Structure 1
């Protein structure tokens, strides 16, 4: 019924510019009919111009299809050579054959993608020429389609069908022991992008969890206004995790809408990947659990059950929700996340891909959870001078604060060793080491504040200068090296890059301003939380700023993924 929306929803992002400009053709036809008042001569001239544009688009489609055909043939030849080599070779062999199977599946997916490209282009050409015929009341569009479009190489080439059949047969005969069902179970390509909406049950569950979360938040606010353990420092981590999951669902939705191929960037399975709806569902469920635990703490209806059981259990459930061996709840994604976390926490011993660095950055923005965990350990170790945990600073607190920065710094060092490109990796390593310097100097100042060493005023100046250095370093890296903004090629996009996938420039400008403000706020919050510093209002400031840090990292995720998709800023791809 409507081909503009169906097409745009089915466009392959990386090939967006190579499809027929159906919307442009619509605008051209509508404008031509709008200016219609000699008159027949003008109509004939418009017809000639329209069909010249059609020929140009058809030629573009043909050249793109020919290039993709050559690429697919080369890929098939390479895959056959690899299969022969693996067969000659036959733990390591199993991994090799699995990688070969994955490569064959990816190549088949590419063939399906280009077949869909061909079908969509032909359908768009036919529909636009039908619209031309209907608007201009002429039977010449069909003649033009039959004369050239019907005989165009892109529509008359069946090499892709033969390649698909050959790939299927080869996989079935040399990778699945002659079973076609198993081969097609992995080769089949379901609808991609936004073509397949999320299940109705998933959306209903997301809505149910959102409603329960909203009502429970209202109830919590009412209980707090009306109505032994620090509840803020125990529940801030959970609240931040829920907020991060919700903002990550928003990030995934925006990436899908803007054509940012985060599936390829994150190296996820394109045939089956988690969507924003599932992230919203998980965030809503975790928020429901968090709200229930906090309400139980506020009320404690059961006396036999101590209050401290409620927080622990909540966070225990969360742990049990992530390390569950059973294949019940997002098991594929949960196992992938577990592997990524293991790689990140063992950063120097694994090659650093985009996913590892991205998760390490997320942890950098989520250090408050580790700080709260360490504070809970301190509370259970000593407090259970009364408030000794938050009144003094120790090295363990500083190293716990710097753990995410340490992980990122070691990742950058490993990347430098692997690639030897000193500039980016070492500049990023220094950016992360500014965090170590700032935290150490803040801890020294806090320790010296208690005793009159006479060298506490000099430790404060060092902390101020290193705070400024770290803030400027992080902001510059975020604006220039992460988002790729402030580029010379952006003639029409001031303070941006040449190409921006997102619709509005206001998004980018507000992002720059918010990045600066919340970078300063994040540095301040890290300074406050790492050490005693403000002994009275520090906790409130940290609690207020941590959600702002999560929001800043969410916007940063948006723009970092955008830059990575447009330009290989992270150099994680060939």
Structure 2
């Protein structure tokens, strides 16, 4: 039933062009039926053309399967050699070997699914052609060629699977098949695995509660402690989580193998539904805290505990040691954060750079944390922490840019490729220069030093430079657009995965606008350029920054899947 949709869902994206073109055959058959008027000879010519196309597709499938089988055999040979060397040596090496064996088993299972689906598609398309043409020649062709095709009559893959299982059990697992087939099973992958019904119900419940609480908050607002600054970080984090769930959904639908790019376990992937559930729960907590602050239902309890607890809970949620509430994902995130914040002492993989960029787009959270620290230290001259700026504010603002710059320097050291890493480092240090000049101008504003205009002009120049640098890097390098190989997709690259180019153009325009918007937001937040409306401008701009980062994540992951722009894979 609807074999085309099932095939499309179960097709491995990396081999999309190497599967059976079921839709093309369906379109050919329908066009032939529509154009049928001499009738017998026309039908004979159409049958000949269809058989030729089927033969071409069968040859393509056979050659692809043969090459993949040879690759699998070579991989098995090298893995066996590595296992023999490890045995001759006789813990971490054993773990790495087990991971490699699981990956090889996944590749074998993918090959088996490829051959099975190709055979099923051949059978289905031949049956459909026979039904439409009211002729039995399709079954004869299938039996003559497809039934005896090498891709369908090769059991070398099942034998490889059996040998891999036996080797894993006897050597790595110490002769117990029960331990094997776990981490070595390859459950349903991709869109072929519907999310749990309970997860979807929880996502819906959290979304509804969040919507109602947001409506209540809006009505209450329309009808001692700065709540905007405190809650902006939480709101931005919740928005980022929701937009990241959307990013994951789009990557799964667009065929972008973000699992491989992020070096995540293919057998256990946190679905977009789980991200939506986490975002909804965090938003529910955030809304409850804000409502409690507005109303103060408990008189004895102070108001300040309401935010402090909320974020604290989130912290306790992230650093929870109990194996519950996405414990594996939380531990992976904690390790990634530790690597990122200690960037110069670790290998900069794709995940580290991506999370550093996310932090760069989430510097408002760090700024709000520093502002809260200042408010607690001093305010508890009115508003001293807001009217006057200091160096620590600038350093906190530049911390994400510092992390990215040091990551780029480490990448340059590792690979010695000057051009990309050094250009990116300059593109991140433009931020240091801009923030430094803005802080100098703000500090000199209070004390007339006769050089305020010089610093203002320097800040404007470096603002323009940084905005142009970031925009050019995003459009040309992160997204790979404006390439010279665009045969038809003007201002884009030759290959695009997303259905519409209008998405690409809208993303280009929104990035152009929002890079300047975010640069303005950084300039306002890190100093006192606009003490009157600065807070509201930053609050309005930060969600726009998160949205820009979400679109950038979309297109950067697309480019990474299409091309090794980040050079994170051999």
Q: TM-score, normalised by structure 2?
A: 1.00
Q: Distance in 2 between matches of 1:471 and 1:77?
A: 52
Runs of 4+ residues over 6 Å off in structure 1: none
Q: Distance in 1 between matches of 2:96 and 2:109?
A: 20
1:206 aligns to what? 203
Q: Distance in 2 between matches of 1:4 and 1:85?
A: 46
C-alpha deviations, 1:458-517, integer Å up to 9, x for none? Answer: 000000000000000000000001000000111110000000000000000000000000
**Secondary structure class of the residue paired with 2:132:** helix
Report how far residue 88 of structure 1 moved: 1.1
C-alpha deviations, 1:162-191, integer Å up to 9, x for none? Answer: 000000000000100001011111210100
Q: Distance in 1 between matches of 2:13 and 2:164?
A: 25
The residue correspondences of 1:524-543 to structure 2 (distance < 5 A) are: 524-543=520-539
2:4 aligns to what? 4
C-alpha deviations, 1:541-562, integer Å up to 9, x for none? Answer: 0000000000000000000000
Q: Distance in 2 between matches of 1:86 and 1:518?
A: 53
The residue correspondences of 1:125-164 to structure 2 (distance < 5 A) are: 125-164=122-161
Q: Distance in 2 between matches of 1:435 and 1:62?
A: 54
**Secondary structure class of the residue paired with 2:476:** helix
**Secondary structure class of the residue paired with 2:190:** coil
C-alpha deviations, 1:271-320, integer Å up to 9, x for none? Answer: 11100000000000000000000000000011110000000000000000
C-alpha deviations, 1:131-162, integer Å up to 9, x for none? Answer: 00000000000000011101111001000000
1:97 aligns to what? 94
Report how far residue 451 of structure 1 moved: 1.0
Q: Distance in 1 between matches of 2:539 and 2:67?
A: 55
Q: Distance in 2 between matches of 1:527 and 1:25?
A: 58
Q: Distance in 1 between matches of 2:292 and 2:529?
A: 33
Q: Distance in 1 between matches of 2:168 and 2:567?
A: 32
Q: Distance in 2 between matches of 1:4 and 1:139?
A: 22
Q: TM-score, normalised by structure 1?
A: 0.99
Report how far residue 38 of structure 1 moved: 1.2
**Secondary structure class of the residue paired with 2:383:** coil
Q: Distance in 2 between matches of 1:301 and 1:422?
A: 59
Q: Distance in 2 between matches of 1:185 and 1:364?
A: 38
Q: Distance in 2 between matches of 1:187 and 1:426?
A: 42
Q: Distance in 1 between matches of 2:327 and 2:9?
A: 29
Check if 1:219 corresponds to 2:216.
yes
**Secondary structure class of the residue paired with 1:459:** helix
C-alpha deviations, 1:222-279, integer Å up to 9, x for none? Answer: 00000x0000000000000000000000000000000000000000000111000000
C-alpha deviations, 1:93-147, integer Å up to 9, x for none? Answer: 8110000000000000000001000000000000000000000000000000011
Q: Distance in 2 between matches of 1:136 and 1:271?
A: 43
**Secondary structure class of the residue paired with 1:182:** coil
Report how far residue 328 of structure 1 moved: 1.0
Q: Which runs of 5+ in 2 are unaligned?
A: none
Q: Distance in 1 between matches of 2:32 and 2:319?
A: 62
CA RMSD of aligned residues (A): 0.5
Report how far residue 452 of structure 1 moved: 1.0
Q: Distance in 2 between matches of 1:443 and 1:40?
A: 84
Q: Distance in 2 between matches of 1:428 and 1:195?
A: 39
C-alpha deviations, 1:327-376, integer Å up to 9, x for none? Answer: 01100000000000000000000000000000000000000000000000
1:32 aligns to what? 32
Aligned length: 570
Q: Which runs of 5+ in 1 are unaligned?
A: none
Q: Distance in 2 between matches of 1:525 and 1:180?
A: 58
1:234 aligns to what? 230
Q: Distance in 2 between matches of 1:124 and 1:509?
A: 37
